[PDB]
Design a protein around this ligand. Structure first.
Ligand SMILES: Nc1ncnc2c1ncn2[C@@H]1O[C@H](COP(=O)(O)OP(=O)(O)O)[C@@H](O)[C@H]1O
Ligand SMILES: Nc1ncnc2c1ncn2[C@@H]1O[C@H](COP(=O)(O)OP(=O)(O)O)[C@@H](O)[C@H]1O
Lengths: 558, 546
């Protein structure tokens, strides 16, 4: 009463006043908690669930049930109070100040006799004040909780409850777990529709139903750091705040798209649900960053189109393709373009090389895992598994069981979800039909036939045309000039210079992979030492020309 | 009543006492985002120290006074509360918060919000009641230590980040504060002096942080200009002498144009290291072409490969580079991957703390051949993005560190085929892509006889100086020098056995001889070799002392 207000807020008084957001569709959990509160002894329920699902919202709905009057006789006229243990632990720089405040609180509850306590952060009840063996909050609340005199409600998390409270059997037998469900998409839509009036009053903006649908279907499908529905309500509230500061109107999909793109860094035009427009123009979107391989681009575009269609059974990974051919043809930047188009991030792709990890000890590092950690952070990521030749049998067993099941069984005891990830196997093993037959019967004589039958599409990359090599050289001098424009370097590459760069930078036995080693050693070091020794300066065009070979050669940086 | 228990900000801008802010529009707009919300409407300002956590608050106050804020912040007054002005304290704080609730349009600024977490007995519930609109200002590490682990606080506080401004942004901040500081100190400041101050602040100062690290320099320079005067212009020389007084660094030509400092490497390194002048000029031209900013500025400033025997000059080259580039040998950090051969030691990548101690420091990653695979992955990540994801959770900047990989792999036409086998073995024993991200690969050369004797003379210079400390005299002949070089000749392992040969032959015998007390004080000691012709192995040759 006069001391409880200094540590918490009267939910019941605000419920009469009417400052509580209403809850819809959580009647089962409210009824279960009301069932537990109706017990004679051990009437303390603990709400078990992930943060951000609505446990405090469930308790507020219970308070709304208290004020309106749909509760039994033993919950009638019971003032609900909330307490935080952080406001009691803090200030205990002396022997027993925390215990003094807690005892004053309990004495006030005993005098009032009609208070149900909400003490969130229930996990610190064992550790508050002194250590776990000495006199703590648990050690003083235990002989009062078990006799059904102090009605308290907790709120914790699965792992939190399991490895704090379940260790203490005496506390476990005093708290009844009431599991709180993670709401579905329709539940979030219904809650947003219910809170439409409150946020219209607060923000003075009009909110549309399509905005709610888009907010929910992007919150659950880009954001994975937490769970529904705090993310969606935060999104719509921040969009309303954005309009409220930009006005000095009507909420549509553009505003929620731009605020979530601000959240994630993904560009706004990709967030709106014009996915058919994405798949219509995806070929030139992929081709502006890839070079050549027109048949490969067409094959992968049709494959991605049929896999995104969803007409297949929803028990399969979204993508599983074999990339074969000589090294350096462009499979890596092809995967990079895939990561850019499908998810809007170049770093959303996970790049692991499997040839270095041989034994089961490194297989523990693989799964049990960094791949597991990244697909738990964000399951909607393309995965790269290079060098499938050198793996050992347990790795093939794990890969094929992931393929056939869509699930991965790690050493951390979580079956991660791979229903939307894209599996890319860039293996250098092994005219187009002859190559398909060669890779097919080579895989049959090396792998199991089920691996070949399980894969979706096999894509073969041909050799790069010399003109396409010149095109890649032009592409790289574009970025070289872009990074050199700070000193006004306008570089001009003559055709003979292009031919010599293509000759020195491309090794047919090694593919195009040594390009990055060749290009800086043959161009950037020379221009850098010419800049340092003042042969050329800023504000002048550098036209490089090469002699002694027009179709040991010396280059001139004119 | 808050006037005697706190300091106003919106009413402080009436007199113009608050300093102007420059270029903080994005952070102020994010604060505008957060303050105009119904849930999580109290922003907390996360920033590394000395950046302007308060400066955005005076910027918001100036925006409120000038009138570029939405309707919810009309007629909002900002108050900073002081705990010094606050039984009686509890009721005073209670009546202050009740007056805030009664007024209804007072927004509070509290710095170091983790200190609230003996005022927690008052604010914690009535903040939960929602009648305070508040902006917090806390460093990220106390945020993670106190607020993030307290689950009852994230329902009302939302994080916003205040990063380090760029150097041009700091120049603009100095340009903004020019009028105030010129008014107060009645001294004149040059724009070139300001840009030099920003650059040298980023260069020679580590403990303090931008942009306070430049503004304190400018105030200090103006103060010392006042001291030297009692037609005043603060210039680059003033900033250089401020840094010389501050960091204890000299000021003659080292706080100057960097091109002259980078073009003189050969003589100053040759002052310490011995020979290998081809590798010296190769690594000198490599660091010249890499550190000049001509590379992409989002990558490490250097990546070096010194293949060769251990302790035969590559470690000496590293020590000389540390002594030249930054003036100190202690910034050179010694990491060898021989000790980091297990995953538990590999996840330690003692590494973050000492490189955060001095970001402008060289690094040594020794024996990369026996490094772990997770070490390979981390080095590949560092080479690719130029950053690092530590266990603490901050990106350690590598715009400034140069990478040195000292390895014993592979150990002029003979040296040509040695370089051929070095590149072949980095192609096969290592992956090609790891060495593809390396600026240059240079291989050391085996020592010649003159190189060995100029090891020998400076090796014996230590004991010669010790003898001069006792007023002795040491003289060596050329025949004894040649024999002593031949005894220590071990090309497989290098110059380390030369230390042992010197120790067993010269120093030990002379330490016994000075105790024998016949060639002690007042006589020059001259070593000589007899019973030796000049070609023999030296088995019949005995050192003699005169
Ligand atoms: N069914 C619901 N009805 C009303 N509000 C809800 C519902 N589910 C979630 N919320 C909102 O989600 C936010 C987080 O819920 P809350 O239980 O208070 O904290 P947490 O779920 O993070 O423990 C609250 O602001 C609440 O208003
Ligand atoms: N953009 C800016 N414009 C003007 N002044 C600035 C700017 N950024 C920082 N400052 C000045 O630099 C000083 C640094 O303040 P700081 O110590 O970071 O505050 P806090 O202690 O709250 O973190 C401030 O007093 C401010 O006047």
């Amino acid at each position: 009463s006069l001391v409880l207000d200094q540590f918490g807020r009267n939910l019941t008084a605000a419920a009469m006043e009417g400052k509580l957001d209403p809850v819809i569709g959580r009647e089962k959990e409210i009824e279960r908690v009301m069932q537990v509160l109706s017990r004679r002894t051990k009437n303390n329920p603990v709400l078990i669930g992930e943060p951000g699902v609505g446990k405090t919202a469930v308790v507020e709905g219970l308070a709304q049930a208290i004020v309106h009057g749909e509760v039994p006789e033993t919950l009638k006229d019971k003032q609900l109070y909330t307490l935080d243990l952080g406001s009691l632990v803090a200030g205990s720089r002396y022997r027993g100040d925390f215990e003094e405040r807690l005892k004053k609180v309990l004495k006030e509850i005993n005098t009032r006799g009609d208070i149900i306590l909400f003490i969130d952060e229930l996990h610190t009840l064992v550790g508050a004040g002194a250590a776990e063996g000495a006199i703590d909050a648990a050690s003083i609340l235990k002989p009062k909780l078990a006799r059904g005199e102090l009605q308290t409600i907790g709120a914790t998390t699965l792992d939190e409850y399991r490895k704090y409270i379940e260790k203490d059997a005496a506390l476990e037998r005093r708290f009844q777990p009431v599991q709180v469900g993670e709401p579905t998409v329709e539940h979030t839509i219904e809650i947003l529709k219910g809170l439409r009036d409150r946020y219209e009053a607060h923000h003075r903006v009009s909110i549309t139903d399509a905005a709610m649908v888009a907010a929910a279907t992007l919150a659950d499908r880009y954001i994975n750091d937490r769970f529904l529905p705090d993310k969606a309500i935060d999104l719509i509230d921040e969009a309303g705040a954005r309009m409220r500061i930009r006005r000095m109107a009507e909420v549509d999909d553009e505003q929620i798209a731009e605020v979530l793109g601000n959240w994630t860094g993904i560009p706004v035009f990709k967030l709106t649900e014009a996915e058919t427009t994405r798949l219509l123009r995806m070929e030139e979107e992929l081709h502006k960053r890839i070079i050549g391989q027109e048949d490969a681009v067409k094959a992968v575009s049709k494959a991605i189109r049929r896999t995104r269609a969803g007409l297949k059974d929803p028990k399969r990974p979204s993508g599983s393709f074999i990339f074969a051919g000589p090294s350096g043809v462009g499979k890596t930047e092809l995967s990079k373009a895939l990561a850019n188009f499908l998810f809007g991030d170049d770093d959303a792709l996970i790049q692991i090389d499997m040839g270095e990890f041989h034994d089961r000890f490194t297989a523990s590092r693989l799964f049990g895992g960094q791949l597991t950690e990244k697909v738990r952070r964000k399951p909607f990521s393309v995965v790269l598994f290079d060098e499938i030749e050198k793996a050992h049998q347990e790795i093939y067993n794990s890969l094929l069981q992931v393929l056939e099941d869509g699930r991965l069984t790690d050493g951390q005891g979580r079956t991660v979800d791979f229903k939307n990830t894209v599996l890319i196997f860039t293996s250098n093993l092994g005219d187009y039909e002859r190559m398909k037959q060669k890779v097919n019967d080579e895989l049959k004589k090396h792998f199991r036939p089920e691996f070949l039958n399980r894969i979706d599409d096999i894509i073969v990359f041909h050799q790069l045309t010399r003109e396409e090599i010149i095109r890649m050289v032009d592409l790289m001098i574009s970025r070289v000039a872009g990074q050199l424009k700070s000193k006004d370097m306008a570089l001009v590459l003559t055709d003979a210079a292009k031919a010599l760069l293509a000759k020195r930078g491309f090794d047919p036995v090694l593919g195009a992979r040594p390009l990055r080693r060749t290009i800086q050693r043959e161009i950037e070091d020379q221009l850098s030492e010419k800049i340092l020794f003042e042969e050329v300066g800023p504000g002048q065009v550098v036209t490089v020309d090469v002699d002694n070979w027009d179709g040991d050669a010396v280059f001139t940086f004119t």
